[PDB]
């Protein structure tokens, strides 16, 4: 086969930018390990920044968002007994996010791309990708036995974290910067009506708690837990005791608890690569960096870098100015870096650290006070959660 | 002797609070360890808030401040070949710092209180402190090998660190918040023209630089230095040239150097104690907290401990409001640890801490990036550096 854009991952990363280029003009086969099945079981992400929003209008795929998804004005930051509110909307001049699953922007996408009828492989086995620094860069891979050759002009690695596309980069081309958290968190999915209409961020003593939501009978709640913790040894029951023992009380006693849909535990992890490319391969999302989730990032993340890669490609191919590529992981990583850094930032303010001295339990107490009580600190979070603006390029 | 208010120590602290005390009709008597001129000796601070120069004007010890001290607008801060000026008058909605010796401020009080014939005793050795938790504490000392012993209502701890007032509370009534970092900085007063009319700040691979200064013909410059440097092995020379391979070129190249006046090392430590009192007694200044001097908040914290002691003290005499004063504790705490956080946080981003990963040091150039791009970004600084305002009560 031949395409122009070989995409690896059918992740929201690949069928974004699959979406955005086949609408373009531009044709692109993705390449995807799973079934489709598989990739729609991912629970995931629930918060969008107004950026990715407007990607997903752009794509002709925000039918079915702008019906069921929920925008929110403002979030809830709980410690020490009080419950402040950061109004997104007023301190960010404007500016809100929208609460739509993962699995629903993914599913809306996957159906999208099969209405057009562009061209998607699912149980594609050992992908592998050759002559990356070539003018005629090919994918590999096994499909149904037979050993099958996709060639190209580039490839976007949309593969997630365990992908194969960052491993395809001679190791000493890179540069990697990575922290590892001494927890993860645990979450439950329920069907239940969500606590609040306002997602709430909790610092309580016996570690961090936070309450989400999918919609009005959908909701998500997290709680921080050791490294060690297994799943299975957290019942519906021993969960919904410890959130009520880490939320304020009159939120305690307005939960609706249930049993639970989905339970997994996920740790902690920030990670970045440096550069993003090597010759013809374009690393996008997971593939390329990791942050925490408290600050609700990681699919933002994606979507920038899509939008990124999408609009450079947009130019080599129907403007013919194919050197703009290189300026992808420049523009990329300095919206990287800033999110990573209120990523880390909200995960010192939110979490119990072990092994914490008296000191650093009273700078972090104090951290919050003042950016929840100065008109200038509650605006630093505001245009952080919101999502700080697109880079423009030319 | 009887007095109704003794105060330990005649620096900073015990002079402000002591000369408040007298104009206001509360007799007051200061006990120092050491004699005037070592006093006058000591350079230290530099940077004053208005809160203290208004502090400084209610003592009426502010006609010679008014005339040689330096209202600075703003402050810079460099970092990988940048130069950021933060508009401290800007952001801040109007407020500036001054610029005035710790020195000129000590003598400019010292000179105040002889000529008001107030008591200060010199050279008053072993010093002690008894029955803090009575209605008549009382404080011994020996003058010229005689044991003395002066009878007060109340006694004023402004003894620094090192002071006796602190060591006289006992250990199990308080609870001690203390971080040491890795460095400290290597201090050169010289009589020479500084570089700029402004102070700058720079985070460079090789470790913090200061640029300050004391008036428009004497300058003081800072370096990060480990904490096995002994001063005999920095040379005038050998401080120069470090302090120009730390600082940008086009402000290296303008820089005028020269022999210095002083050299010192001094380790850099946040301290906090609470409570702040016991019984009789009441701890102000160093002898209750130290700050790295990255925010140049020392001094600071000392006025508003001595704004807020007298004011309390002054209910108490005036008004025989004597309850008020169990707030004390309380009032300074929260100015003090957003200060402390504020330190911390300037110590954290401009220097070079041993033993970091790549990730961190990349966390720490984005936190600047950040901070001086940002308009909210720089209102935190802005607003912290000129100084948050002090509490009222009632
Ligand atoms: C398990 C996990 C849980 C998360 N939970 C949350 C959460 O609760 N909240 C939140 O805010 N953020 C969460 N995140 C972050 C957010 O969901 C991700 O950043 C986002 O999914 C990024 O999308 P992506 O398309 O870049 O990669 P992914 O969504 O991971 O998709 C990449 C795709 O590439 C495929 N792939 C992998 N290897 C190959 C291969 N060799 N060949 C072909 N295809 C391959 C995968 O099967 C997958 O379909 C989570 C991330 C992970 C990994
Ligand atoms: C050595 C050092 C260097 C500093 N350098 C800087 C600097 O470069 N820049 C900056 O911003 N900040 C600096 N600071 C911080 C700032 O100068 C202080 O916070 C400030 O001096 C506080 O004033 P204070 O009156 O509370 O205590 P101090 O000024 O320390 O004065 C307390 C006084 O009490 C006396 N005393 C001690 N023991 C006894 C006793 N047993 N009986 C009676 N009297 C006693 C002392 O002799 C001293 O006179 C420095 C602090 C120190 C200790």
Same mark, same amino acid.
């Given at each position: 086969?031949?395409?122009?854009?070989?995409?690896?991952?059918?992740?929201?990363?690949?069928?974004?930018?699959?979406?955005?280029?086949?609408?373009?003009?531009?044709?692109?086969?993705?390449?995807?390990?799973?079934?489709?099945?598989?990739?729609?079981?991912?629970?995931?992400?629930?918060?969008?920044?107004?950026?990715?929003?407007?990607?997903?209008?752009?794509?002709?795929?925000?039918?079915?968002?702008?019906?069921?998804?929920?925008?929110?004005?403002?979030?809830?930051?709980?410690?020490?007994?009080?419950?402040?509110?950061?109004?997104?909307k007023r301190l960010?001049?404007?500016?809100?996010?929208?609460?739509?699953?993962?699995?629903?922007?993914?599913?809306?996408?996957?159906?999208?791309?099969?209405?057009?009828?562009?061209?998607?492989?699912?149980?594609?086995?050992?992908?592998?990708?050759?002559?990356?620094?070539?003018?005629?860069?090919?994918?590999?891979?096994?499909?149904?036995?037979?050993?099958?050759?996709?060639?190209?002009?580039?490839?976007?690695?949309?593969?997630?974290?365990?992908?194969?596309?960052?491993?395809?980069?001679?190791?000493?081309?890179? @540069? !990697?910067?990575?922290?590892?958290?001494?927890?993860? =968190?645990?979450? &439950?999915? $329920?069907?239940? +009506?969500?606590?609040?209409? #306002?997602?709430?961020?909790?610092?309580?003593?016996?570690?961090?708690?936070?309450?989400?939501?999918?919609?009005?009978?959908?909701?998500?709640?997290?709680?921080?837990?050791?490294?060690?913790? @297994? !799943?299975?040894?957290?019942?519906?029951?021993?969960? =919904?005791?410890? &959130?009520? $023992?880490?939320? +304020?009380?009159?939120?305690? #006693?307005?939960?609706?608890?249930?049993?639970?849909?989905?339970?997994?535990?996920?740790?902690?992890?920030?990670?970045?690569?440096?550069?993003?490319?090597?010759?013809?391969?374009?690393?996008?999302?997971?593939?390329?960096?990791?942050?925490?989730?408290?600050?609700?990032?990681?699919?933002?993340?994606?979507?920038?870098?899509?939008?990124?890669?999408?609009?450079?490609?947009?130019?080599?191919?129907?403007e013919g100015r194919?050197?703009?590529?290189?300026?992808?992981?420049?523009?990329?990583?300095?919206?990287?870096?800033?999110?990573?850094?209120?990523?880390?930032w909200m995960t010192?303010?939110?979490?119990?650290?072990?092994?914490?001295?008296?000191?650093?339990?009273?700078?972090?107490?104090?951290?919050?006070?003042?950016?929840?009580?100065?008109?200038?600190?509650?605006?630093?979070?505001?245009?952080?959660?919101?999502?700080?603006?697109?880079?423009?390029?030319?």
């Amino acid at each position: 086969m031949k395409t122009q854009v070989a995409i690896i991952g059918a992740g929201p990363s690949g069928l974004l930018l699959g979406q955005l280029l086949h609408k373009a003009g531009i044709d692109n086969v993705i390449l995807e390990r799973q079934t489709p099945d598989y990739v729609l079981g991912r629970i995931r992400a629930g918060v969008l920044e107004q950026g990715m929003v407007d990607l997903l209008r752009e794509a002709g795929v925000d039918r079915r968002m702008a019906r069921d998804g929920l925008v929110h004005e403002g979030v809830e930051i709980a410690f020490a007994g009080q419950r402040r509110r950061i109004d997104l909307k007023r301190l960010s001049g404007g500016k809100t996010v929208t609460v739509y699953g993962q699995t629903e922007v993914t599913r809306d996408l996957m159906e999208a791309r099969e209405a057009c009828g562009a061209t998607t492989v699912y149980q594609a086995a050992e992908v592998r990708l050759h002559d990356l620094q070539g003018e005629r860069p090919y994918v590999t891979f096994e499909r149904d036995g037979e050993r099958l050759r996709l060639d190209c002009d580039y490839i976007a690695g949309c593969d997630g974290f365990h992908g194969i596309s960052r491993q395809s980069i001679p190791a000493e081309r890179l @540069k !990697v910067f990575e922290r590892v958290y001494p927890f993860g =968190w645990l979450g &439950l999915l $329920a069907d239940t +009506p969500p606590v609040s209409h #306002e997602l709430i961020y909790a610092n309580h003593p016996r570690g961090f708690a936070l309450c989400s939501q999918r919609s009005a009978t959908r909701s998500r709640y997290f709680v921080q837990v050791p490294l060690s913790e @297994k !799943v299975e040894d957290w019942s519906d029951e021993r969960f =919904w005791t410890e &959130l009520k $023992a880490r939320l +304020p009380s009159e939120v305690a #006693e307005k939960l609706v608890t249930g049993p639970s849909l989905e339970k997994s535990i996920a740790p902690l992890r920030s990670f970045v690569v440096e550069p993003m490319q090597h010759g013809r391969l374009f690393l996008a999302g997971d593939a390329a960096h990791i942050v925490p989730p408290t600050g609700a990032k990681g699919l933002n993340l994606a979507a920038s870098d899509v939008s990124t890669l999408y609009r450079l490609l947009l130019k080599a191919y129907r403007e013919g100015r194919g050197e703009l590529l290189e300026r992808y992981s420049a523009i990329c990583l300095r919206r990287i870096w800033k999110a990573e850094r209120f990523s880390w930032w909200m995960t010192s303010v939110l979490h119990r650290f072990p092994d914490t001295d008296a000191f650093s339990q009273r700078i972090q107490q104090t951290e919050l006070e003042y950016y929840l009580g100065s008109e200038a600190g509650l605006a630093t979070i505001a245009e952080n959660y919101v999502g700080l603006p697109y880079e423009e390029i030319e």
